[PDB]
């Protein structure tokens, strides 16, 4: 009845898949490059690199910084992150030996708490990995003011807020790099898929290398990684130059992605009409608070946070919703800091406390938003949550 | 002249029918076809378990990572792992990515695999693992290798991405190790667009693999599992429960469907490839200036290597030009001597055992041409006329 996701595909995605089958060219190639070109143009970045998933997009975004001619990050360098996000926003950090400093969320926007950040940022701060949660962008004016002239790298995990904007600028393009996901239930879907955008040429070339075996095939002749490639094909076929991975996306995902990008403006439009209806329906709810919008959110889903002293218990809310046929979820990692076990592998610290994340973990959950009008489902959702 | 490219399509109507079936279903994310494929995969090779992943590179990544995650961790940073000097780039990276101390050992110029004698010399009390690689279809001699280990605490891993279908002593390559990796890239034994697989007989490793393949969550773990012991019944609780630092390297449902079809054809593909190898060997056996690969067990012959004989006055670049002129696609023998890679090596904590002169000689004098699952008699005659 009210599922988290639905299909974003029509006949065009199916015909694109058919074009690839017809071409018999399956390995990352022409459609992926065209998709990358369109993607960068769509969100306003100079360059885009498509990868296997938004999670390998995050992996290369962190890895890239160790491989610049002059490394931008090194083991033990401190990186600041919000206490609530997806697991693979944090794993790469652990995988590359960074010192993770968690900062609390603001219970209203669900994004990193700006006042807490202002205090967490010190001279030891090397990067801030922001997360635009559930479609809602971070106020980049405030964040950039905090950074100021400091040598702190801004990064964005934008896997939940494709299409979101702040001051007419697309989320994902504020950081030195920004990542996106095109998994099934996201704003666009390419079966699986992710993308890294950047305007930095060295970074872009490093990404081209580390995505595909750390080889030079995808680098241009004149490039920041190897300088100038040899004109001899045998010489540049298996030439390995950086410790990377094979995280190439498939030509089908690229082909499908191109059609999705064309539908994106309408998807965001509908998703925002859904949010308007929803917020109007929930504006003055007796016991539930909704996400507070920054810039223009792309509304990935609709969160609820049980109001304090409402007496309301989350467990029951969930039953009710489920019992009513309404799919729901926790708000992603909820408080990631509760993963004591996995945290055993990290080099980390917590700035101040993550009191809001804790409250969220126990009092929040989310229901779906889609690229199709959901007025009936929202009406029902409000009734069920009488 | 003649068209003799490195690889050709291994698909027929059946692979397209499989894709159609996924399309009709509307379920694209890793599911039932992948599950089925893993079941068939394990059976095909004789392992208890199989875990399909996005590529043979991500299969190697998970193979190494899992060893850090067992309840009693089987490896830790700085631990010593020995690997041959020649293989694929992604055989090496995960090693550096997990902060291991890599010990390089020369290859045998005949088999193209790790030099046994050198391996025997290299194994010390500090040796924690041996990451064997069955090159170009050729399995390692696991008897000799196991003798060397001699009931000592050294884990054996195999990177079997180039030797699907090889056997040694009636045992399938990939199954000698605690773990074994395979690739299903286009130019490989079977092809699922991109694809990899890790096989093991270890239930803990199997579960660790299932967790780290997908977000480090518990979704794909059974209620009772070696990672979290016992799952909660409350799904809201197990919805997004994160327990091991993993990745998202899931394969696509289409890849699993295609793969099932591919596994049925494999035996025939191996048959054709070996008959091609027979003709090739008969044709190049007394070549005046080129050595071929010496077979161990029953090779699956991924491709046909050549190494210019010392003192021949023959130059690789020439043969390369010659081959291309003829329309014969060729490649260096994979990484060649990986030790030349100062650019990548600067990020490693490694050492070299003795020397890698053979790997060096191969690096300057070696190359390979293709083998396919379709007869290549004319193409081989042609190749023999070109390399005259
Ligand atoms: C020891 C070891 N360990 C791990 C790995 C990594 O496995 P993985 O590649 O991550 O799955 C490997 C991988 N080795 C493979 C890698 O898979 C590598 O990508 C592959 O290199 P390649 O043969 O030079 O890749 P290629 O130039 O893309 O494909 C060779 C020919 O096939 C053609 N081709 C590739 N894909 C397609 C396709 O989809 N359609 C058509 N028509 N032709 C295709 C290309 O045009 C070439 O003519 O061969 C290497 C030896 C390995 O050797
Ligand atoms: C901050 C952040 N950073 C990084 C990432 C990683 O990106 P990525 O997932 O690696 O691309 C993410 C990823 N977030 C997503 C991930 O995409 C994650 O996998 C997802 O969890 P999920 O919504 O529970 O994914 P699911 O339960 O497997 O599928 C969602 C619904 O859609 C349905 N569905 C999924 N795939 C298909 C399909 O192929 N066909 C059909 N018909 N239905 C499908 C399922 O039945 C579910 O009801 O939602 C999370 C919020 C992120 O949030
Ligand atoms: Na949704
Ligand atoms: Na700080
Ligand atoms: Na930008
Ligand atoms: Na959507
Ligand atoms: Na081949
Ligand atoms: Na075995
Ligand atoms: Na190199
Ligand atoms: Na013929």
Q: What is the DSSP string of A10-26?
A: -HHHHHHHHHHHHHT--
Examine the domain organization and report whether A246 and A297 are in the same domain. no
Counting one residue from chain A and one from chain B, the pairs whose CB atoms sit within 8 A come to 147
Mutate to test the pocket of ligand 2, among B23, B24, B27 (most ligand atoms within 8 A of CB): B27
Cβ(A105)–Cβ(A356) below 8 Å = yes
**Given CA atoms B355, B358, B363, B368 in this order, what sign does their dihedral have?**
negative
CA distance A123 to A152: 9
Instruction: Name the token pair of B189.
Output: 């034994």
Examine the domain organization and report whether B284 and B260 are in the same domain. no
Q: At what angle do helices B13-25 and A11-23 cross, to 10 degrees?
A: 170
Atom of ligand 1 nearest to the CA of A27: 39
CA distance A300 to A293: 12
Q: Identify the nearest ligand to the CA of A160 by its number.
A: 2
Ligand 1 centre from B174 Cα, in Å?
19
Ligand 1 centre from B254 Cα, in Å?
19
Judged by CB atoms closer than 8 Å, whether chains meet at A245 and B16 is answered as no
Nearest CA to B290 out of B335, B340, B330, B326 is that of B330
Backbone angles phi, psi at A53, to 5 degrees: -165, 165
- Establish whether A373 is an annotated binding residue: yes
Q: How many helices (H) and strands (E) does chain B have?
A: 13, 16
Nearest beta carbon to residue B217 from set A87, A252, A318: A87
CA distance B257 to B255: 5
In this structure, the strands spanning B330-331 and B303-308 are: unpaired
CA distance A286 to A308: 11
Residue B299 CA to chain centroid, in angstroms? 13
In the structure, which protein residues have their CB atom closer than 6 angstroms to any atom of ligand 2? A 3-5, 53-55, 58, 85-86, 88-89, 131, 157, 159-160, 181, 183-186, 194, 332; B 26-29, 248
CA distance B249 to B181: 14
Examine the domain organization and report whether A55 and A42 are in the same domain. yes
Cβ(B367)–Cβ(B319) below 8 Å = yes
Token look-up 């095939």 returns A217
CA distance A81 to A103: 6
Mutate to test the interface with B, among A240, A260, A318 (most CBs of B within 10 A): A240
**Who contacts A233 (Cβ-Cβ below 8 Å, separation ≥6)?**
none
Tell me, yes or no, if B322 comes closer than 8 A to chain A by beta carbon.
no
In this structure, the strands spanning B167-168 and B171-172 are: antiparallel
In this structure, the strands spanning B290-291 and B49-53 are: unpaired
Contacts of A238 in chain B (CB under 8 A): 331-332, 334-336
Cβ(A179)–Cβ(A159) below 8 Å = yes
Q: Identify the nearest ligand to the CA of A134 by its number.
A: 2
Token look-up 């639905």 returns A6
Instruction: Name the token pair of B269.
Output: 């593909």
Ligand 1 neighbour B295 (Cβ under 6 A): no
CA distance B196 to A380: 45
| β-bridge mates for residue A101, sequence order | A80, A349
Examine the domain organization and report whether B17 and B157 are in the same domain. yes
Examine the domain organization and report whether A257 and A373 are in the same domain. no
Last residue of a domain, one of A234, A262, A290: A262
User: In sequence order, what DSSP letters do the residues of B139-150 get, joined into one string?
Assistant: PP-HHHHHHHHT
Contacts of A329 in chain B (CB under 8 A): 236, 239-240
CA distance B19 to B13: 10
Q: In what order do the strands lie in the sheet with A364-368?
A: A288-290, A301-306, A364-368
Which burial class, exposed, middle or buried, applies to A338 when counting CB atoms under 10 A from its CB (0-12, 13-18, 19+)? middle
Nearest CA to A156 out of A245, A82, A104 is that of A82
**Who contacts A46 (Cβ-Cβ below 8 Å, separation ≥6)?**
A40, A198, A199, A201, A204
Contacts of B254 in chain A (CB under 8 A): 191, 252
In chain B, the residue whose alpha carbon lies closest to the alpha carbon of A20 is B193
Three-class SS of residue B29? Answer: strand
How many residues are given for chain A?
386
CA distance A121 to A129: 12
Cβ(A84)–Cβ(A157) below 8 Å = no
Cβ(B109)–Cβ(B307) below 8 Å = yes
B228-237 burial, b at 16+ Cβ within 10 Å, e below that, comes to: beebeeeebe
Three-class SS of residue B305? Answer: strand
Q: How many helices (H) and strands (E) does chain A have?
A: 12, 15
Tell me, yes or no, if B23 comes closer than 8 A to chain A by beta carbon.
yes
| Min distance B60 CA to chain A CA atoms (Å) | 10
Three-class SS of residue B130? Answer: strand
| β-bridge mates for residue B81, sequence order | B102, B129
Contacts of A231 in chain B (CB under 8 A): none
Instruction: Name the token pair of B233.
Output: 């019944």
Tell me, yes or no, if A375 comes closer than 8 A to chain B by beta carbon.
no
With left for phi above 0 and alpha for psi between -120 and 50, is residue A252 left, alpha or beta? alpha
Cβ(B181)–Cβ(B165) below 8 Å = no
Last residue of a domain, one of B264, B280, B307: B264
Three-class SS of residue B183? Answer: strand
Backbone angles phi, psi at A206, to 5 degrees: -60, -45
Q: Which helix (H) or strand (E) holds B49?
A: strand B49-53
CA dihedral A104, A107, A112, A118 (to 10 degrees): -70
Rg of chain B, C-alpha, whole Å: 21
Last residue of a domain, one of A262, A294, A325: A262
**Who contacts A226 (Cβ-Cβ below 8 Å, separation ≥6)?**
A216, A219, A239, A241
Cα B14–Cα B15–Cα B17 angle in degrees, nearest 5: 60
**Given CA atoms A351, A353, A358, A364 in this order, what sign does their dihedral have?**
negative
CATH code, domain carrying A72: 3.40.640.10
Token look-up 């605490």 returns B153
Contacts of B92 in chain A (CB under 8 A): 243
Q: How many CA atoms lie within 13 A of B114 on its CB side?
A: 28
**Given CA atoms B42, B47, B48, B50 in this order, what sign does their dihedral have?**
negative
CA dihedral B210, B216, B222, B223 (to 10 degrees): 160
- Establish whether B375 is an annotated binding residue: yes
Q: How was this structure determined?
A: X-ray
Ligand 4 centre from A78 Cα, in Å?
7
CATH code, domain carrying B343: 3.90.1150.10
| Min distance A17 CA to chain B CA atoms (Å) | 9
Nearest CA to A152 out of A85, A74, A201, A80 is that of A80
Nearest beta carbon to residue A241 from set B54, B245, B343: B343
Examine the domain organization and report whether A335 and A386 are in the same domain. yes
Tell me, yes or no, if A340 comes closer than 8 A to chain B by beta carbon.
no
Contacts of A334 in chain B (CB under 8 A): 240
Nearest CA to A159 out of A88, A93, A212, A208 is that of A88
Cβ(B130)–Cβ(B145) below 8 Å = yes
Range of the domain at A330: 263-386
CA distance B105 to B96: 16
Token look-up 């079941």 returns B39
Ligand 6 centre from A193 Cα, in Å?
14
CA distance B14 to A27: 19
CA distance A132 to A158: 6
Q: In what order do the strands lie in the sheet with A78-82?
A: A47-51, A194-198, A177-181, A153-157, A125-131, A78-82, A99-103, A347-350
With left for phi above 0 and alpha for psi between -120 and 50, is residue A334 left, alpha or beta? left
Token look-up 């900062």 returns A103
| Min distance B282 CA to chain A CA atoms (Å) | 27
CA distance B193 to A209: 20
Nearest CA to B371 out of B362, B363, B383, B388 is that of B383
Ligand 7 centre from B301 Cα, in Å?
9
**Who contacts B167 (Cβ-Cβ below 8 Å, separation ≥6)?**
B139, B173, B297, B298
Nearest CA to A17 out of A261, A264, A253 is that of A253
Three-class SS of residue A6? Answer: coil
Cβ(A194)–Cβ(A50) below 8 Å = yes
CA distance A173 to A198: 7
CB atoms within 10 A of CB A297: 27
Nearest CA to A159 out of A196, A204, A124 is that of A196
Cβ(A360)–Cβ(A331) below 8 Å = yes
**Given CA atoms B68, B128, B351, B316 in this order, what sign does their dihedral have?**
negative
CB atoms within 10 A of CB B90: 27
Examine the domain organization and report whether A244 and A230 are in the same domain. yes
Examine the domain organization and report whether A365 and A378 are in the same domain. yes
Residue nearest to atom 45 of ligand 2 (CA): A5
Token look-up 């076929």 returns A237
Instruction: Name the token pair of A266.
Output: 């309408």
**Who contacts A305 (Cβ-Cβ below 8 Å, separation ≥6)?**
A107, A288, A289, A290, A359, A360, A363, A364
Contacts of A26 in chain B (CB under 8 A): 186, 193
CA distance A314 to A330: 10
How does DSSP classify residue B99?
T
Q: Which helix (H) or strand (E) holds B172?
A: strand B171-172
Nearest CA to B155 out of B183, B123, B182 is that of B123
Cβ(A338)–Cβ(A89) below 8 Å = no
How far is residue A215 from each of residues A72, A378, B388, measured CA to CA in Å?
21, 50, 33
Tell me, yes or no, if B85 comes closer than 8 A to chain A by beta carbon.
no
Q: At what angle do helices B13-25 and B253-284 cross, to 10 degrees?
A: 170
CA distance B227 to B247: 16
Nearest CA to B195 out of B258, B246, B151, B145 is that of B258
Ranges assigned E (strand) in chain A: 47-51, 78-82, 99-103, 125-131, 153-157, 165-166, 169-170, 177-181, 194-198, 222-223, 227-228, 288-290, 301-306, 347-350, 364-368
Instruction: Name the token pair of A35.
Output: 């998709």
In chain A, the residue whose alpha carbon lies closest to the alpha carbon of B186 is A27
**Given CA atoms A223, A34, B192, B273 in this order, what sign does their dihedral have?**
negative
User: In sequence order, what DSSP letters do the residues of A338-364 get, joined into one string?
Assistant: G-HHHHTT-EEEESS--HHHHHHHHHE
| β-bridge mates for residue B134, sequence order | none
Mutate to test the interface with B, among A4, A186, A243 (most CBs of B within 10 A): A243
Q: Identify the nearest ligand to the CA of A101 by its number.
A: 4
CA distance A272 to A293: 11
CA distance A32 to A248: 10
Residues 134-193 of B with CB under 8 A from A: 185-186, 193
Token look-up 């060397």 returns B148
**Who contacts A304 (Cβ-Cβ below 8 Å, separation ≥6)?**
A288, A289, A290, A317, A364, A365, A366, A367, A385
Examine the domain organization and report whether A129 and A179 are in the same domain. yes
Examine the domain organization and report whether B307 and B233 are in the same domain. no
Ligand 1 centre from B158 Cα, in Å?
19
Cα A302–Cα A304–Cα A309 angle in degrees, nearest 5: 170
Tell me, yes or no, if B344 comes closer than 8 A to chain A by beta carbon.
yes
CA distance A58 to A67: 15
Examine the domain organization and report whether A18 and A95 are in the same domain. yes
Residue A45 CA to chain centroid, in angstroms? 16
**Who contacts A111 (Cβ-Cβ below 8 Å, separation ≥6)?**
A82, A105, A130, A131, A132, A133, A136, A137, A138, A139, A294
Cβ(B133)–Cβ(B91) below 8 Å = yes
Tell me, yes or no, if A112 comes closer than 8 A to chain B by beta carbon.
no
Cβ(A77)–Cβ(A44) below 8 Å = no
In this structure, the strands spanning A78-82 and A99-103 are: parallel
Query: How many independent structural domains does chain B possess?
Result: 2
CA distance B76 to B56: 23
Judged by CB atoms closer than 8 Å, whether chains meet at B193 and A252 is answered as yes
Three-class SS of residue B351? Answer: strand
Cβ(A267)–Cβ(A299) below 8 Å = no
Ligand 6 centre from A371 Cα, in Å?
5
In this structure, the strands spanning B196-200 and A125-131 are: unpaired
Token look-up 């195999």 returns B158
| β-bridge mates for residue A99, sequence order | A78, A347
User: In sequence order, what DSSP letters do the residues of A313-338 get, joined into one string?
Assistant: -HHHHHHHHHHTTB--B-STTSSGGG
CA distance A84 to A335: 5
For this entry, resolution in Å reads 1.7
Examine the domain organization and report whether B113 and B236 are in the same domain. yes
CB atoms within 10 A of CB B357: 12
């Amino acid at each position: 009845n009210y599922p988290l996701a639905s299909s974003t595909w029509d006949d065009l995605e199916y015909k694109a898949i058919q074009s690839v089958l017809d071409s018999k060219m399956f390995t990352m190639g022409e459609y992926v490059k065209q998709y990358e070109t369109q993607f960068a143009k769509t969100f306003g970045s100079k360059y885009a690199v498509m990868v296997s998933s938004g999670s390998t997009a995050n992996l290369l975004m962190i890895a890239a910084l160790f491989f610049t001619k002059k490394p931008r990050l090194k083991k033990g360098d401190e990186i600041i992150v919000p206490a609530v996000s997806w697991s693979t926003t944090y794993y790469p950090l652990q995988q590359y030996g960074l010192r993770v400093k968690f900062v609390d969320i603001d219970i209203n926007t669900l994004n990193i708490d700006i006042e807490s950040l202002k205090e967490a940022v010190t001279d030891s701060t090397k990067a801030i990995l922001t997360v635009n949660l559930l479609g809602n962008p971070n106020n980049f004016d405030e964040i950039n003011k905090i950074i100021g002239g400091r040598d702190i790298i801004l990064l964005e995990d934008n896997c939940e807020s494709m299409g979101a904007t702040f001051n007419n600028k697309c989320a994902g393009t504020f950081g030195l790099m920004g990542t996106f996901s095109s998994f099934y239930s996201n704003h666009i879907a390419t079966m699986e898929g992710g993308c890294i955008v950047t305007d930095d040429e060295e970074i872009y070339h490093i990404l081209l290398c580390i995505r595909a075996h750390g080889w030079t095939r995808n680098l241009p002749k004149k490039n920041k990684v190897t300088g100038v490639k040899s004109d001899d094909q045998f010489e540049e076929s298996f030439k390995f130059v950086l410790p990377g991975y094979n995280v190439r996306p498939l030509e089908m995902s690229g082909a499908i992605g191109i059609e999705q990008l064309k539908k994106l403006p309408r998807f965001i439009s509908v998703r925002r009409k859904n949010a308007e209806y929803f917020l109007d329906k929930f504006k003055d709810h007796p016991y539930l608070d909704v996400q507070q919008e920054t810039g223009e959110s792309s509304w990935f889903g609709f969160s609820f946070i049980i109001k304090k002293d409402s007496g309301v218990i989350r467990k029951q809310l969930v039953e009710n919703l489920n019992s009513a046929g309404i799919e729901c979820r926790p708000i992603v990692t909820g408080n990631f800091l509760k993963n004591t076990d996995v945290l055993k592998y990290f080099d980390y610290t917590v700035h101040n406390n993550v009191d809001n994340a804790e409250y969220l973990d126990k009092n929040g959950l989310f229901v779906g938003n889609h690229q199709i009008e959901l007025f009936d489902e929202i009406d029902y959702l409000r009734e069920v949550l009488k």
